[PDB]
Symmetry: C2
Subunit: 234 residues, 2 copies
């Protein structure tokens, strides 16, 4: 863990908490015959732009699996309570301060990579760094994806199933004429260390995205989702 004199310290933090309600043991449940978190550690390792890849967990079993797959677990966070679910920003800040305070290493660019993100592309990770660093004023870069249907044409259902538009002014508007819309794909978030530390708001500062195609963005929120995403990963 020597580094070039003059190089910038770029790291991956992979948060993972125990306790997930919908899919028990979600972060270590097998996905295509590895614990789910393995795929994120593996992608971070293959990307080649990180000098450290750390799992931040509050759970000793998850810690064990992360070490098994070659991530660093330099600390274990104390178990969270349900009425105090730590935000991503709180976990990332914790890790950055811990590195500074406990190890005297000052991160510059910090990538939060989700534990459940098995279609993440090593290359998208590196593209995000490059966008973060090329644009001097950029504080964050996150994985995003296009909405597959125009948000302007969204409808709501009343309590009796009756349809109405959210925005009736677009009822007759040409599709070509609707402004393109995107959302957070929920896979990775690069930020400048000071951005995370200062709790800058990602969607309101100088933020860029790496755009992922729809097929690489997969919901894995239920057991039925986990099955369908396994069948597709093969």
């Amino acid at each position: 863990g020597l580094v070039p004199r003059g190089s910038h310290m770029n790291i991956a933090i992979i948060p993972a908490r125990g306790g997930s309600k919908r899919i028990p043991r979600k972060n270590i449940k097998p996905f295509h015959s590895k614990p789910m978190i393995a795929w994120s550690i593996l992608a971070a390792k293959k990307a080649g732009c990180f000098e450290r890849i750390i799992v931040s967990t509050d759970d000793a079993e998850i810690a064990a699996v992360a070490l098994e797959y070659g991530a660093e677990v330099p600390f274990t966070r104390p178990a969270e309570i349900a009425n105090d679910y730590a935000t991503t920003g709180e976990v990332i800040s914790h890790a950055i301060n811990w590195l500074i305070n406990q190890q005297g290493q000052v991160p510059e660019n910090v990538c939060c990579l989700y534990a459940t993100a098995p279609f993440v592309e090593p290359d998208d990770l590196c593209q995000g760094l490059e966008l973060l660093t090329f644009n001097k004023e950029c504080q964050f870069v996150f994985s995003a994806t296009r909405f597959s249907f125009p948000i302007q044409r969204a409808i709501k259902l009343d309590e009796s199933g009756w349809v109405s538009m959210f925005h009736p002014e677009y009822q007759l508007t040409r599709s070509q004429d609707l402004e393109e819309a995107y959302h957070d794909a929920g896979q990775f978030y690069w930020g400048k260390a000071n951005a995370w530390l200062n709790k800058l708001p990602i969607f309101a500062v100088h933020t860029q995205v790496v755009l992922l195609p729809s097929h690489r963005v997969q919901d894995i929120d239920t057991q039925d989702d986990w099955l369908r995403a396994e069948k597709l990963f093969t």
Copy 2:
């Protein structure tokens, strides 16, 4: 083609035009080793709630394939021009008037089923009828699906890649507190015959939906999409 005395005339119309720019011959291109339109005719036949299943096309080759798979092609529309792409409503109205005028049969409930809709469930088709008919004032029922990410948190990109929110007032709003949003899945549209004939606006009248789960709603807009949707259909 005898019917019970006192029964209501319920039909499927499957529009199909030639000329598709992105996927040539899209409506008859093989999908899992049948022409794409076959899957829609097949589902309509299996649903068991239609007394006629008609393909409305402007193309003799498509007509041939539709007859081959057991749809009726009682007429061929004259080829369209590119500067006069007929709306769904125009095609449906044409077919309904044609049945009345040319054959003296008056449709009551009319289902427009897209030619490219291979994950459509026979049962969803029948559920739509039942919703159309149970609710006296209902003019339309269409296949819809939830947005997978909240539309209120959508972002836009300026010409330099810079992120901003469409609706900054929701920057800190709880996910639980966002109103659920849906969109037209683009698979089928039931309507009362008079609704189609009177050109009633689907999203502004008495309209219901049949809600399809995300995995059954698949984009098939490109050649790469056609491949991925074949791999999944197996």
